[PDB]
């Protein structure tokens, strides 16, 4: 790896600089290099890894959606044929997106998940596994779409089981996991009722636990609860 010669601490320092400069591809490469040093990641370092790849794949997903929409219009009745270029370029972006997801999933499998023993780290990584399989599912169309969907579901489910046993209902990781699993149900699994049920139960159980929190933790938890509410308003 091109980062093999750089100190772990220097990679983390440069990831933070890249974030400030909005150089998210650089940030992801730095954090990949840090993971490949083989040591476990701290809470702050896990966040840096997530921020970097979220922004990289986020741009790819937005581009894929633009191109997919153009491609679908080109396949309507009365649409003048324009050749293979739209499909080709959508496939190009799709392949790069799949490559980023495979990279993240590879880091989780070698060997972040197996070393993660604490609930906070294990749930974080399993949520990430579900998220990146979900992004693969957004673009999947062939024989393996069902298996990709089940891989996302399985990761989210293991994360949910741990989070419910080991974390308070206001924990921001637990909340973000449930938010994302609910989006999976609605947008990927064709299960809108399950999505709505999960969002509502998650919100209500967090509401009942807010009284235990400091002002700062209260702000962290309510921010994610508002996203659950926003989705419920969209879906009902």
């Amino acid at each position: 790896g091109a980062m093999g010669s750089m100190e772990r601490a220097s990679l983390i320092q440069k990831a933070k600089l890249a974030e400030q400069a909005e150089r998210y591809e650089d940030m992801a490469a730095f954090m990949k290099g840090a993971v490949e040093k083989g040591e476990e990641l701290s809470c702050e370092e896990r966040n840096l890894l997530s921020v970097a790849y979220k922004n990289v794949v986020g741009g790819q997903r937005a581009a894929w959606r633009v191109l997919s929409s153009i491609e679908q219009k080109s396949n309507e009745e009365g649409s003048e044929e324009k050749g293979p270029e739209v499909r080709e370029y959508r496939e190009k972006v799709e392949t790069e997106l799949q490559g980023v997801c495979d990279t993240v999933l590879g880091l989780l499998d070698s060997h972040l998940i197996k070393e993660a023993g604490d609930a906070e780290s294990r749930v974080f990584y399993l949520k990430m596994k579900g998220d990146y399989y979900r992004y693969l599912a957004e673009v999947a169309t062939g024989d393996d779409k069902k298996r990709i969907i089940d891989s996302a579901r399985s990761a989210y489910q293991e994360a949910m089981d741990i989070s419910k046993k080991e974390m308070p209902p206001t924990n921001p990781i637990r909340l973000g996991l449930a938010l994302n699993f609910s989006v999976f149900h609605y947008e990927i699994a064709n299960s809108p009722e399950e999505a709505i049920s999960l969002a509502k139960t998650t919100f209500d159980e967090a509401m009942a636990d807010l009284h235990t929190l400091s002002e700062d933790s209260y702000k962290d938890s309510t921010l994610i609860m508002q996203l659950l509410r926003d989705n419920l308003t969209l879906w009902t």
Partner: peptide, 6 residues
């Protein structure tokens, strides 16, 4: 729909 922020 909104998913979790980093």
């Amino acid at each position: 729909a909104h998913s979790s922020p980093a």
